[PDB]
Amino acid sequence: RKVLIISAGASHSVALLSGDIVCSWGRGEDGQLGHGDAEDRPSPTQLSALDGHQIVSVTCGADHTVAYSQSGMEVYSWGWGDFGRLSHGNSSDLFTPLPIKALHGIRIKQIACGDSHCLAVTMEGEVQSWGRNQNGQLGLGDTEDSLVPQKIQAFEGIRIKMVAAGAEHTAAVTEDGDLYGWGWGRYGNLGLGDRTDRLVPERVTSTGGEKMSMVACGWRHTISVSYSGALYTYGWSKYGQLGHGDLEDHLIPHKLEALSNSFISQISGGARHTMALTSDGKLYGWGWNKFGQVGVGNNLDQCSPVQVRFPDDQKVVQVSCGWRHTLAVTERNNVFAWGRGTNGQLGIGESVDRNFPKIIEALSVDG
DSSP, X not given: XXXXXXXXXXXXXXXXXXXXXXXXXXXXXXXXXXXXXXXXXXXXXXXXXXXXXXXXXXXXXXXXXXXXXXXXXXXXXXXXXXXXXXXXXXXXXXXXXXXXXXGTTOOEEEEEXXXXXXXXXXXXXXXXXXXXXXXXXXXXXXXXXXXXXXXXXXXTTOOEEEEEEOSSEEEEEETTSOEEEEEOOTTXXXXXXXXXXXXXXXXXXXXXXXXXXXXXXXXXXXXXXETTSOEEEEEOOTTSTTOSSSOOOEEEEEEOGGGTTXXXXXXXXXXXXEXXXXXXXXXXXXXXXXXXXXXXXXXXXXXXXXXXXOGGGOOEEEEEEOSSEEEEEXXXXXXXXXXXXTTSTTOSSSOOOEEEEEEOGGGOSOO
């Protein structure tokens, strides 16, 4: 079957396959795999509770997972409840997928989760957020938790295209190309030219004169792409995750000039590493590589983008960063994984680390 979506969290991985099949693997201790038990799974395992629910999207937070169905009009979540903050009014452990009843019937465009908060964008450009709000990451104007989703009123009259969630911060781009940041901002990762937290979304004005089409977040860094395919990074670079060939912080978006010859079509942020996919199918990685998660065949941090290589230079069509691992799908409908593997999150079966892409036989044609 075709792999439609891949997503990765702290220590787990999830995929959506053609034919409405959800597959999860890796660490299971807090229910994030959704199979009704707490066991790790070192190979992709079908999430049977969602059979026939016509799931169209899946995404991972740190130890939490969310999925939604268009036809069912339903959003589901499971995994770590963060002491009530992410279990949307349920006192149960979520070891199997549970509907978020406040989101039923809402037409969902996108869901993003960070460590302790999630956001949903509706087809009309509205944003609803829920979870922990200690640093304003929900965008609601205070630091009060919201177990039940609530609309970000700061965006009234502004159609949001996509959102991204880091550890304790949040970013968004509008349909018109404006870029926003809110939440924890001490490393400059909001892009606002300072180190202050924001309790409501604030517009990033130093965008190189460009409109932005996409944003992604890691722990303490943020990545955006402009309409011309230029890539920008800002925030923490202690591990090279901003990619500018040094370890300098940036408090406003900084164009990654080494990629200027390429048009970036997709981006992903890990905890302390970064992935960018060009329109040509070339995948570039940089940042923290202690566990091999950049994919360049060693365990040394990479402060400049390096091309990740696949057999016969088959093109990459999708990439997703977890905290310490990375997943990618290719044009041959192969799925590769690399990085930290000790809880099974590479899905290769033997729960070991890899510093170079390795094929997931269970999801791949050349498997």
